[PDB]
Swiss-Prot record, chain B:
GO terms for molecular function: DNA binding; DNA-binding transcription repressor activity; identical protein binding; nickel cation binding; sequence-specific DNA binding; transcription cis-regulatory region binding. One of its GO terms (cellular component) is protein-DNA complex. InterPro entries: Acetolactate_synth/TF_NikR_C, ACT-like_dom_sf, Arc_rbn_hlx_hlx, CopG, CopG/NikR_regulator, Ni_resp_reg_NikR, Ribbon_hlx_hlx, TF_NikR_Ni-bd_C. GO terms for biological process: negative regulation of DNA-templated transcription; regulation of DNA-templated transcription; response to nickel cation. Ni(2+) binds at residues 80, 91, 93, 99. Disulfide bonds: none annotated. This is Putative nickel-responsive regulator. Transmembrane segments: none annotated. The keyword Glycoprotein does not apply. Keywords: DNA-binding, Metal-binding, Nickel, Transcription, Transcription regulation. It comes from the Bacteria. Transcriptional regulator.
C-alpha cells in the first residue's frame, strides 16, 4: 500500500530539481516530490466544485500584536462573518506585542481562504499562513 | 536526454493523483508529475529554505488515526526526545477515527525538520505539515 512508479523527465529538469535540493533541507528527492505531489493535489482539490460544501478542515497560523487595540476583535469579527467554524484556538503570549495563534477551522474552501486573506491584511498581523487538508488524505 | 526516477506514494495519494490526471486531461502519471516539478522550480524560495542554527518558532499540524494503539505514546516519545522546545500540543477529534493535533515549538531548522519527519513517518499518521516563522 505504498506504491512505486517511475517518472520520466529530461536529464536537465531532473538536475534542475537536484541542484535545487542541494540547498534544500529535504532528506531526499523522493520525499521532496512526494510532498510536492501532496501539496499540489490538495491545492487542486481546494480549487473545485461546491460552495455548498462546508466540510474542509484547515489550520490558520497567525502571529499578531495582541497589544494593538481592536486587532483581536477584528480577527474575531472577520471569522464570525466568514461562515467558517472554529473548532479550537490555541494562543501563546510571546511578549507585550506578539501573540501566536493556531486556529483550527472547518468550512468551505472559499470561506477559509478568504479568512486567511482578510486577516493577513490587517495592520499588526505579522504572519498568517494556512495549512490545508483534503479528505483524500485522511478518509 | 530522458531519465526515469522512482517515486514512492502511499496508495491514497496515488489514487488521488490518478483521479487528478483524469479530471485535468493529463496523459500519464509521468506527465502530471513532470508538470508539477516545473511549477515548483518556478518558485524561488522553498519551505525547507536554507537550514541554519537560528532558533525559529514553528507549528506542526498532524492528522492521525486515533484508533491506532500506542501511536500517541510514540508521538509523545518523539516530542520529549526532541532537541526542540515544544511549547504545547493541542488535540481534537475530527470524526470517529481521525484526530488532529497542533504542535507549537521552537528550535533550529535541523531540529524542526527531524521532528516533522519522525512524526510523519509513523504508521497511522496521515500527514505532518510544517509552518515555520522566521
Ligand atoms: Ni497573547
Ligand atoms: Ni478518542
Amino acid at each position: 500500500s505504498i506504491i512505486r512508479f517511475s517518472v520520466s523527465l529530461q536529464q536537465n529538469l531532473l538536475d534542475e530539481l537536484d541542484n535545487r535540493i542541494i540547498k534544500n533541507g529535504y532528506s531526499s528527492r523522493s520525499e521532496l516530490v512526494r510532498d510536492m505531489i501532496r501539496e499540489k493535489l490538495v491545492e487542486d482539490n481546494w480549487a473545485e466544485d461546491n460552495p455548498n460544501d462546508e466540510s474542509k478542515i484547515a489550520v490558520l497560523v497567525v502571529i499578531y500584536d495582541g497589544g494593538q487595540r481592536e486587532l483581536n476583535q477584528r480577527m474575531i469579527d472577520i471569522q464570525h462573518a466568514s461562515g467558517t467554524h472554529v473548532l479550537c484556538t490555541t494562543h501563546i503570549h510571546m511578549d507585550e506585542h506578539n501573540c501566536l495563534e493556531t486556529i483550527i477551522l472547518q468550512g468551505n474552501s472559499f470561506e477559509i481562504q478568504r479568512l486567511q486573506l482578510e486577516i493577513g491584511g490587517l495592520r499588526g498581523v505579522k504572519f498568517a499562513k494556512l495549512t490545508k487538508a483534503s479528505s483524500f488524505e485522511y478518509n
